[PDB]
Protein backbone atom coordinates (compact mmCIF):
# COMPACT_ATOMS: atom_id res chain seq x y z
CA UNK A 1 0.00 0.00 0.00
CA UNK A 2 1.14 3.51 -1.13
CA UNK A 3 2.40 6.14 1.75
CA UNK A 4 1.96 9.53 0.50
CA UNK A 5 0.53 12.32 2.41
CA UNK A 6 -2.71 12.31 -0.21
CA UNK A 7 -2.72 8.43 -0.01
CA UNK A 8 -2.95 8.86 3.84
CA UNK A 9 -5.50 11.27 3.79
CA UNK A 10 -7.95 10.13 1.71
CA UNK A 11 -7.64 6.67 3.55
CA UNK A 12 -8.29 8.26 6.84
CA UNK A 13 -11.38 10.62 5.10
CA UNK A 14 -12.60 7.18 4.46
CA UNK A 15 -12.02 5.74 7.74
CA UNK A 16 -13.29 8.42 9.23
CA UNK A 17 -17.01 8.07 7.10
CA UNK A 18 -16.90 4.52 8.23
CA UNK A 19 -15.99 4.68 11.77
CA UNK A 20 -16.02 8.72 13.04
CA UNK A 21 -13.33 10.61 15.24
CA UNK A 22 -13.54 8.42 18.30
CA UNK A 23 -13.05 5.18 16.60
CA UNK A 24 -10.50 6.75 14.34
CA UNK A 25 -7.43 5.44 15.58
CA UNK A 26 -3.30 5.40 14.11
CA UNK A 27 -3.99 1.44 14.90
CA UNK A 28 -7.18 1.21 12.56
CA UNK A 29 -5.46 3.41 9.87
CA UNK A 30 -2.17 1.21 9.52
CA UNK A 31 -4.87 -1.44 9.24
CA UNK A 32 -7.01 -0.46 6.52
CA UNK A 33 -4.19 1.00 4.65
CA UNK A 34 -2.49 -2.78 4.90
CA UNK A 35 1.13 -1.75 6.51
CA UNK A 36 2.37 -2.58 9.83
CA UNK A 37 2.15 -0.01 12.76
CA UNK A 38 6.03 1.33 12.58
CA UNK A 39 6.20 1.61 9.02
CA UNK A 40 3.05 4.37 9.53
CA UNK A 41 4.18 5.81 12.59
CA UNK A 42 7.07 7.79 10.26
CA UNK A 43 4.44 9.33 8.20
CA UNK A 44 1.62 9.70 10.93
CA UNK A 45 3.23 10.74 14.60
CA UNK A 46 0.09 10.25 15.88
CA UNK A 47 -3.91 11.03 15.98
CA UNK A 48 -3.47 14.83 16.69
CA UNK A 49 -1.33 15.08 13.63
CA UNK A 50 -4.06 13.38 11.62
CA UNK A 51 -6.86 15.50 12.82
CA UNK A 52 -5.23 18.59 12.24
CA UNK A 53 -4.50 16.99 8.67
CA UNK A 54 -7.98 15.85 8.14
CA UNK A 55 -9.68 19.53 9.07
CA UNK A 56 -7.11 21.06 6.77
CA UNK A 57 -8.45 18.84 3.76
CA UNK A 58 -12.25 18.83 4.48
CA UNK A 59 -11.96 22.75 4.06
CA UNK A 60 -9.29 22.87 1.61
CA UNK A 61 -11.60 20.46 -0.61
CA UNK A 62 -14.72 21.66 0.12
CA UNK A 63 -15.08 25.62 1.14
CA UNK A 64 -14.92 27.27 -2.04
CA UNK A 65 -16.31 30.10 -1.13
CA UNK A 66 -14.02 31.32 1.33
CA UNK A 67 -12.93 34.51 0.45
CA UNK A 68 -15.18 37.28 -1.14
CA UNK A 69 -15.58 37.45 -4.85
CA UNK A 70 -14.11 40.99 -5.95
CA UNK A 71 -17.34 43.76 -6.35
CA UNK A 72 -20.00 42.13 -4.31
CA UNK A 73 -22.00 42.74 -1.38
CA UNK A 74 -20.55 41.97 2.17
CA UNK A 75 -24.13 40.72 2.94
CA UNK A 76 -23.48 38.43 0.03
CA UNK A 77 -20.39 37.33 1.16
CA UNK A 78 -21.43 36.37 4.65
CA UNK A 79 -24.16 34.32 3.19
CA UNK A 80 -22.14 32.32 0.76
CA UNK A 81 -19.50 31.78 3.09
CA UNK A 82 -21.54 29.95 5.72
CA UNK A 83 -23.51 28.20 3.35
CA UNK A 84 -19.98 27.20 1.82
CA UNK A 85 -18.92 26.16 5.79
CA UNK A 86 -22.55 24.60 6.09
CA UNK A 87 -21.39 21.87 3.23
CA UNK A 88 -18.12 21.23 3.21
CA UNK A 89 -18.75 20.67 7.08
CA UNK A 90 -21.87 18.34 6.12
CA UNK A 91 -19.51 16.43 3.70
CA UNK A 92 -18.03 13.88 6.41
CA UNK A 93 -18.88 12.20 9.64
CA UNK A 94 -17.89 14.37 13.00
CA UNK A 95 -17.18 17.04 10.18
CA UNK A 96 -17.58 19.63 12.71
CA UNK A 97 -16.13 18.20 15.56
CA UNK A 98 -12.63 17.39 13.45
CA UNK A 99 -12.84 20.72 12.74
CA UNK A 100 -13.67 22.46 15.91
CA UNK A 101 -10.52 20.16 17.51
CA UNK A 102 -7.62 21.72 15.53
CA UNK A 103 -6.17 25.08 16.14
CA UNK A 104 -6.05 27.25 12.61
CA UNK A 105 -3.17 27.43 10.86
CA UNK A 106 -1.00 29.58 8.32
CA UNK A 107 -3.42 28.86 5.87
CA UNK A 108 -6.54 30.04 7.53
CA UNK A 109 -5.03 33.04 8.77
CA UNK A 110 -4.52 34.31 5.35
CA UNK A 111 -8.10 33.89 4.44
CA UNK A 112 -9.23 35.22 7.71
CA UNK A 113 -6.95 38.15 7.19
CA UNK A 114 -8.76 39.02 3.78
CA UNK A 115 -11.82 38.83 5.07
CA UNK A 116 -11.49 41.36 7.85
CA UNK A 117 -9.98 43.93 5.20
CA UNK A 118 -13.17 43.05 3.23
CA UNK A 119 -15.47 43.91 6.13
CA UNK A 120 -13.33 47.12 7.37
CA UNK A 121 -13.53 48.14 3.77
CA UNK A 122 -16.96 47.99 3.07
CA UNK A 123 -17.59 50.11 6.61
CA UNK A 124 -16.86 48.30 9.62
CA UNK A 125 -14.95 48.91 12.76
CA UNK A 126 -12.01 45.97 13.07
CA UNK A 127 -14.20 44.75 16.43
CA UNK A 128 -17.48 44.80 14.67
CA UNK A 129 -16.06 43.35 11.61
CA UNK A 130 -14.54 41.01 13.82
CA UNK A 131 -17.72 39.91 15.25
CA UNK A 132 -19.78 39.61 12.27
CA UNK A 133 -17.73 37.02 11.27
CA UNK A 134 -17.42 35.19 14.78
CA UNK A 135 -20.99 35.01 15.30
CA UNK A 136 -21.42 33.66 11.53
CA UNK A 137 -19.04 31.18 12.23
CA UNK A 138 -20.52 30.33 15.67
CA UNK A 139 -24.33 30.11 14.32
CA UNK A 140 -23.14 27.95 11.59
CA UNK A 141 -20.99 25.67 14.06
CA UNK A 142 -23.86 25.33 15.94
CA UNK A 143 -26.46 24.35 13.34
CA UNK A 144 -23.83 22.21 11.96
CA UNK A 145 -23.28 20.73 15.26
CA UNK A 146 -26.87 20.08 16.19
CA UNK A 147 -27.86 17.99 12.79
CA UNK A 148 -24.46 15.62 12.69
CA UNK A 149 -25.13 14.58 16.33
CA UNK A 150 -29.30 14.07 15.67
CA UNK A 151 -45.18 15.08 22.62
CA UNK A 152 -47.28 18.39 23.44
CA UNK A 153 -49.53 20.03 21.14
CA UNK A 154 -47.85 23.28 19.51
CA UNK A 155 -44.44 21.40 19.42
CA UNK A 156 -45.91 18.38 17.62
CA UNK A 157 -47.61 20.93 15.06
CA UNK A 158 -44.52 22.56 14.36
CA UNK A 159 -41.93 19.46 14.93
CA UNK A 160 -43.32 18.43 11.15
CA UNK A 161 -42.11 21.11 9.80
CA UNK A 162 -38.22 20.80 11.22
CA UNK A 163 -38.30 17.54 10.44
CA UNK A 164 -39.20 17.71 6.50
CA UNK A 165 -36.00 18.85 6.21
CA UNK A 166 -32.41 18.45 6.66
CA UNK A 167 -32.52 21.88 9.16
CA UNK A 168 -31.43 24.18 6.25
CA UNK A 169 -34.07 25.98 5.86
CA UNK A 170 -34.12 27.09 9.52
CA UNK A 171 -30.57 27.59 9.38
CA UNK A 172 -31.11 30.37 6.15
CA UNK A 173 -34.19 31.60 7.87
CA UNK A 174 -31.09 32.72 10.76
CA UNK A 175 -28.57 33.53 8.65
CA UNK A 176 -30.59 36.23 7.22
CA UNK A 177 -32.16 37.50 10.37
CA UNK A 178 -28.52 37.78 11.68
CA UNK A 179 -27.36 39.42 8.60
CA UNK A 180 -30.00 41.77 8.89
CA UNK A 181 -28.79 42.54 12.57
CA UNK A 182 -25.53 43.74 11.24
CA UNK A 183 -27.03 46.53 8.79
CA UNK A 184 -29.14 47.63 11.37
CA UNK A 185 -25.84 48.17 13.32
CA UNK A 186 -23.45 49.11 10.51
CA UNK A 187 -25.54 51.98 9.28
CA UNK A 188 -26.22 53.31 12.76
CA UNK A 189 -23.21 54.33 13.50
CA UNK A 190 -23.02 57.07 16.62
CA UNK A 191 -26.79 57.23 16.79
CA UNK A 192 -28.97 55.41 19.50
CA UNK A 193 -30.41 51.97 17.71
CA UNK B 1 -19.80 4.86 49.98
CA UNK B 2 -23.23 5.92 49.17
CA UNK B 3 -24.95 5.09 46.18
CA UNK B 4 -28.17 7.50 46.06
CA UNK B 5 -28.91 8.95 42.78
CA UNK B 6 -28.14 12.50 43.86
CA UNK B 7 -24.47 11.36 45.48
CA UNK B 8 -23.76 9.11 42.18
CA UNK B 9 -24.91 12.81 40.11
CA UNK B 10 -22.61 15.02 42.12
CA UNK B 11 -19.65 12.62 42.51
CA UNK B 12 -19.98 12.03 38.71
CA UNK B 13 -20.02 15.91 37.90
CA UNK B 14 -17.00 16.08 39.89
CA UNK B 15 -15.03 13.52 38.26
CA UNK B 16 -16.47 15.73 34.85
CA UNK B 17 -14.82 18.84 35.85
CA UNK B 18 -11.31 16.63 36.63
CA UNK B 19 -11.11 14.08 33.61
CA UNK B 20 -13.51 15.72 31.01
CA UNK B 21 -16.50 13.56 29.43
CA UNK B 22 -14.12 11.51 26.70
CA UNK B 23 -11.95 10.67 30.17
CA UNK B 24 -15.12 9.83 31.93
CA UNK B 25 -15.77 5.71 32.22
CA UNK B 26 -18.52 3.87 34.86
CA UNK B 27 -15.17 2.40 35.84
CA UNK B 28 -13.84 5.17 36.59
CA UNK B 29 -17.01 7.08 38.69
CA UNK B 30 -16.92 3.44 40.85
CA UNK B 31 -13.77 3.83 41.89
CA UNK B 32 -13.99 7.34 42.67
CA UNK B 33 -16.75 6.20 45.02
CA UNK B 34 -14.85 3.05 46.37
CA UNK B 35 -17.14 0.46 45.41
CA UNK B 36 -17.12 -3.01 43.43
CA UNK B 37 -17.96 -2.03 39.73
CA UNK B 38 -20.82 -4.82 39.70
CA UNK B 39 -22.32 -2.34 42.69
CA UNK B 40 -21.97 0.59 40.70
CA UNK B 41 -23.81 -1.45 37.54
CA UNK B 42 -27.13 -2.38 39.81
CA UNK B 43 -27.22 1.81 39.95
CA UNK B 44 -25.85 2.72 36.52
CA UNK B 45 -26.45 0.51 33.69
CA UNK B 46 -23.82 2.50 31.37
CA UNK B 47 -21.32 5.83 30.29
CA UNK B 48 -25.13 6.82 28.10
CA UNK B 49 -27.22 6.77 30.92
CA UNK B 50 -24.83 8.66 32.99
CA UNK B 51 -24.46 11.36 30.29
CA UNK B 52 -27.91 11.74 29.73
CA UNK B 53 -28.25 12.40 33.75
CA UNK B 54 -25.76 14.60 33.89
CA UNK B 55 -27.36 16.91 31.34
CA UNK B 56 -30.60 17.36 32.81
CA UNK B 57 -28.62 17.65 36.16
CA UNK B 58 -26.49 20.30 34.43
CA UNK B 59 -29.71 22.36 33.22
CA UNK B 60 -31.69 21.68 36.61
CA UNK B 61 -29.25 23.35 38.47
CA UNK B 62 -28.44 26.28 36.70
CA UNK B 63 -30.35 27.20 33.63
CA UNK B 64 -32.94 29.45 36.14
CA UNK B 65 -34.14 31.32 32.87
CA UNK B 66 -35.97 28.77 31.44
CA UNK B 67 -39.65 30.00 31.16
CA UNK B 68 -40.03 33.76 30.43
CA UNK B 69 -41.10 36.03 33.59
CA UNK B 70 -44.74 36.78 33.45
CA UNK B 71 -45.29 40.28 31.59
CA UNK B 72 -41.50 40.44 29.53
CA UNK B 73 -40.82 41.61 25.67
CA UNK B 74 -40.07 38.42 23.89
CA UNK B 75 -36.84 40.42 23.21
CA UNK B 76 -35.67 40.33 26.58
CA UNK B 77 -36.80 36.48 26.98
CA UNK B 78 -33.92 34.90 24.18
CA UNK B 79 -31.50 37.19 25.63
CA UNK B 80 -31.71 36.33 29.44
CA UNK B 81 -33.01 32.74 28.41
CA UNK B 82 -29.55 32.70 25.94
CA UNK B 83 -27.31 34.10 28.54
CA UNK B 84 -28.19 31.51 31.60
CA UNK B 85 -28.34 28.99 29.24
CA UNK B 86 -24.35 29.91 28.38
CA UNK B 87 -23.44 30.04 31.95
CA UNK B 88 -25.06 27.01 32.88
CA UNK B 89 -22.94 24.90 29.46
CA UNK B 90 -19.95 26.81 30.86
CA UNK B 91 -20.35 25.74 34.48
CA UNK B 92 -18.86 22.49 33.87
CA UNK B 93 -15.95 21.46 31.79
CA UNK B 94 -17.13 19.51 28.34
CA UNK B 95 -20.66 20.81 28.97
CA UNK B 96 -21.72 21.76 26.15
CA UNK B 97 -20.64 18.21 24.88
CA UNK B 98 -22.55 16.45 27.56
CA UNK B 99 -25.93 18.74 26.37
CA UNK B 100 -25.22 18.04 22.67
CA UNK B 101 -25.08 14.54 22.98
CA UNK B 102 -27.96 14.00 24.79
CA UNK B 103 -31.37 13.27 23.14
CA UNK B 104 -34.14 15.84 25.27
CA UNK B 105 -36.79 14.56 27.83
CA UNK B 106 -40.08 15.05 29.37
CA UNK B 107 -38.60 18.24 31.34
CA UNK B 108 -37.32 19.87 28.38
CA UNK B 109 -40.19 19.21 25.98
CA UNK B 110 -42.49 21.06 28.46
CA UNK B 111 -40.12 24.21 28.57
CA UNK B 112 -39.90 24.19 25.03
CA UNK B 113 -43.75 24.13 24.90
CA UNK B 114 -43.98 27.22 27.20
CA UNK B 115 -41.63 28.98 25.01
CA UNK B 116 -43.42 28.42 21.74
CA UNK B 117 -46.50 29.29 23.16
CA UNK B 118 -44.83 32.37 24.62
CA UNK B 119 -43.54 32.93 21.10
CA UNK B 120 -47.26 33.10 19.09
CA UNK B 121 -48.92 35.00 21.54
CA UNK B 122 -46.33 37.64 21.15
CA UNK B 123 -47.36 37.67 17.48
CA UNK B 124 -44.76 34.64 15.99
CA UNK B 125 -46.18 32.22 13.50
CA UNK B 126 -45.13 28.28 14.51
CA UNK B 127 -42.68 28.05 12.34
CA UNK B 128 -40.79 31.42 12.91
CA UNK B 129 -41.35 31.04 16.64
CA UNK B 130 -39.54 27.53 16.83
CA UNK B 131 -36.85 28.87 13.90
CA UNK B 132 -36.06 32.08 16.44
CA UNK B 133 -35.85 29.75 19.61
CA UNK B 134 -33.88 27.50 17.43
CA UNK B 135 -31.39 29.95 16.21
CA UNK B 136 -30.40 31.56 19.40
CA UNK B 137 -29.16 27.66 20.49
CA UNK B 138 -27.15 26.72 17.64
CA UNK B 139 -25.59 30.37 18.21
CA UNK B 140 -25.15 29.69 22.06
CA UNK B 141 -23.97 26.23 21.35
CA UNK B 142 -21.80 27.10 18.43
CA UNK B 143 -19.97 30.13 20.56
CA UNK B 144 -19.62 27.94 23.72
CA UNK B 145 -18.55 25.15 22.12
CA UNK B 146 -15.21 27.53 20.35
CA UNK B 147 -14.98 28.78 24.03
CA UNK B 148 -14.91 25.28 26.33
CA UNK B 149 -12.44 23.95 23.01
CA UNK B 150 -10.12 26.69 23.36
CA UNK B 151 0.62 36.58 12.65
CA UNK B 152 -1.30 38.98 9.80
CA UNK B 153 -2.07 43.01 10.65
CA UNK B 154 -5.45 43.36 10.71
CA UNK B 155 -5.69 39.93 12.78
CA UNK B 156 -2.97 40.98 15.23
CA UNK B 157 -5.01 44.19 15.80
CA UNK B 158 -8.28 42.76 16.35
CA UNK B 159 -6.87 39.80 18.07
CA UNK B 160 -6.52 41.58 21.43
CA UNK B 161 -9.80 42.58 21.75
CA UNK B 162 -11.42 39.13 21.64
CA UNK B 163 -8.55 37.53 23.92
CA UNK B 164 -8.80 39.91 26.75
CA UNK B 165 -12.02 38.43 27.17
CA UNK B 166 -13.75 34.90 27.94
CA UNK B 167 -15.40 35.68 24.63
CA UNK B 168 -19.07 37.44 26.73
CA UNK B 169 -18.57 40.47 24.70
CA UNK B 170 -18.37 38.90 21.15
CA UNK B 171 -21.19 36.66 21.72
CA UNK B 172 -23.84 40.06 23.56
CA UNK B 173 -22.85 41.02 20.38
CA UNK B 174 -24.38 38.76 17.68
CA UNK B 175 -27.08 37.89 20.50
CA UNK B 176 -28.56 41.46 19.90
CA UNK B 177 -28.39 41.51 16.32
CA UNK B 178 -29.59 37.86 16.54
CA UNK B 179 -32.59 39.30 18.19
CA UNK B 180 -32.89 42.42 16.06
CA UNK B 181 -32.86 40.70 12.40
CA UNK B 182 -36.24 38.91 13.71
CA UNK B 183 -37.81 42.28 14.97
CA UNK B 184 -37.23 43.30 11.81
CA UNK B 185 -38.71 39.88 10.85
CA UNK B 186 -41.93 39.79 13.13
CA UNK B 187 -43.04 43.49 12.06
CA UNK B 188 -42.79 43.10 8.60
CA UNK B 189 -45.41 40.48 8.28
CA UNK B 190 -46.79 39.49 4.04
CA UNK B 191 -44.22 43.15 2.96
CA UNK B 192 -41.34 42.80 1.29
CA UNK B 193 -38.38 43.91 3.72
Redesign the interface.
Given at each position: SRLDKSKVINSALELLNEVGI?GLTTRKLAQKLGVEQPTLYWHVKNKRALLDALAVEILARHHDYSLPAAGESWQSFLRNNAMSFRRALLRYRDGAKVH??T?PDEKQ??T??TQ??FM?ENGFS???????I??V???????V??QQ???????R??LQ??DSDDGE???L??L???????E??LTALLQIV
Open positions: ELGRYDVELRTLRDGLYASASHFTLGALEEHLPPLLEAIMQAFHGESLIRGFVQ
